[PDB]
């Protein structure tokens, strides 16, 4: 099922009502805009072109959480469209307000802010760079020690998105000090945390030799080889993939994987019922020959 609607003098009136001193008129317009921004790129574009972004960004400073959550939601949805749409969010000045929100004692606000930064960081290298230049990395890395598993997964995802940019963007992640926190997380008894940390680490390990060498130095290899003993097949797959990425580096990084005791563990996984596990294990093992 699908409804079509034309815009629309309503949309600017909607935008105009974000500055309205009537909070329920305000909230009604706000909910309406978030609903529209949750459609296609076409819909998202209509919200942008109606000039919603400056007003939405202003609301990120509100001491009213009801207003704020809905505005964050709207922004996050816009940032799930095209790169130029993500860019319009950045141009509107959303990033400094988003970063400031990373220190919120409100877990709902914090996760929504992280989720929105994540969406922005999911775009092109231009958009990723803006997040870094806005200064998100230090608060992001700090959140890696969070005892809150829900906040942790959200920070891991955003960091991973940042780390899927060019080699210089990955390096910014490494330089903000993400690697010791991640490596530590590889020691968790929580398989869900492991999958999340490996997603991010793997993105880092897919960089150039300098980025890969940093991963080696932070002691990721022993932890990765330990995970090759995991009964959980998702973990095996992520750990194999991360390792395969390291083993795609130079002779130096390859030699490091060889010295890490990975060959026995890989040789067993080569005889696995799981086809994905069988494959990545065979390949990882082959690259380091």
As a whole number of angstroms, the distance between CA 84 and CA 94 comes to 14
Among the listed residues 277, 283, 204, the one whose alpha carbon sits nearest the alpha carbon of residue 247? 283
List the one residue from 42, 107, 217, 259 that touches a copy of itself (CB under 8 A). 42
The radius of gyration of the chain from alpha carbons, rounded to an integer in Å, stands at 22
- For a copy of itself, which residue of 199, 216, 249, 266 counts as binding (CB under 8 A)? 199
Shortest Å, Cβ 154 to a copy of itself? 8
Q: How far apart are CA 202 and CA 257, in angstroms?
A: 15
Ramachandran assignment for 8, one of left (phi > 0), alpha (psi -120 to 50 degrees), beta (any other): left
Closest to a copy of itself by CB, 157 vs 266, is 157
> Binders of Ca ion among 33-62, rule CB under 5 A?
42
The binder of 271, among a copy of itself, Ca ion, none, by C-beta within 5 to 8 A per type, is: none
Helices (H), the chain: 10-16, 23-36, 41-49, 52-58, 65-78, 83-91, 94-101, 107-121, 125-134, 137-142, 149-162, 167-175, 178-185, 191-205, 209-217, 220-227, 233-246, 251-258, 262-269, 275-287
The site partner of 237 among Ca ion, a copy of itself, none (C-beta below 5 to 8 Å per kind) is a copy of itself
Per rule CB under 8 A, is residue 157 in the interface with a copy of itself?
Answer: yes
Q: Which does 208 bind (CB under 5 to 8 A by kind): Ca ion, a copy of itself, none?
A: none
Selection from a copy of itself, Ca ion, none that 82 binds (CB < 5 to 8 A by kind) is a copy of itself
* Contacts of 216 by beta carbon, 8 Å cutoff, 6+ apart: 246, 253, 256
The pattern of x and - marking residues 226 through 255 that bind a copy of itself according to CB under 8 A reads -----------xx-----------------
Binding site for a copy of itself (CB under 8 A): 2, 4, 6, 9, 39-42, 80-83, 115, 118-119, 122, 153, 157, 160, 195, 199, 237-238, 276, 279-280
Binding site for Ca ion (CB under 5 A): 21, 42, 63, 105, 122-123, 147, 189
């Amino acid at each position: 099922s699908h409804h079509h609607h034309h815009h629309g003098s309503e949309l600017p009136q909607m935008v105009q009502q974000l500055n309205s001193p009537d909070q329920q008129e305000l909230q009604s317009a706000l909910r309406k805009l978030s609903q529209i921004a949750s459609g296609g790129n076409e819909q998202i574009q209509a919200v942008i072109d109606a000039g919603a972004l400056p007003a939405l960004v202003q609301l990120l400073s509100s001491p009213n959480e009801q207003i704020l959550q809905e505005a964050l939601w709207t922004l996050g949805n816009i940032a799930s469209g095209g790169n130029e749409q993500i860019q319009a969010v950045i141009d509107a000045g959303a990033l400094p307000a988003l970063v400031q929100l990373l220190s919120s004692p409100n877990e709902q606000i914090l996760q929504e802010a992280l989720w929105t930064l994540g969406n922005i960081a999911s775009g092109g290298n231009e958009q990723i760079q803006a997040v870094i230049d806005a200064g998100a990395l230090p608060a992001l890395v700090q959140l890696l020690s969070s005892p809150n598993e829900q906040i942790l997964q959200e920070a891991l995802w955003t960091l991973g998105n940042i780390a899927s940019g060019g080699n210089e963007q990955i390096q910014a992640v490494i330089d903000a000090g993400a690697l010791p926190a991640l490596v530590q997380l590889l020691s968790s008894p929580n398989e869900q945390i492991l999958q999340e940390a490996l997603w991010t680490l793997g993105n880092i390990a897919s960089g150039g030799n300098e980025q890969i060498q940093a991963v080696i130095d932070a002691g990721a290899l022993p932890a990765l080889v330990q995970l090759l003993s995991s009964p959980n097949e998702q973990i095996l797959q992520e750990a194999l993939w991360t390792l395969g990425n390291i083993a795609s580096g130079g002779n130096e990084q390859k030699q490091a994987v060889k010295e890490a005791g990975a060959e026995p563990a890989l040789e067993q996984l080569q005889s696995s019922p799981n086809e994905k596990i069988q494959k990545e294990a065979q390949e990882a093992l082959e690259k380091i020959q």
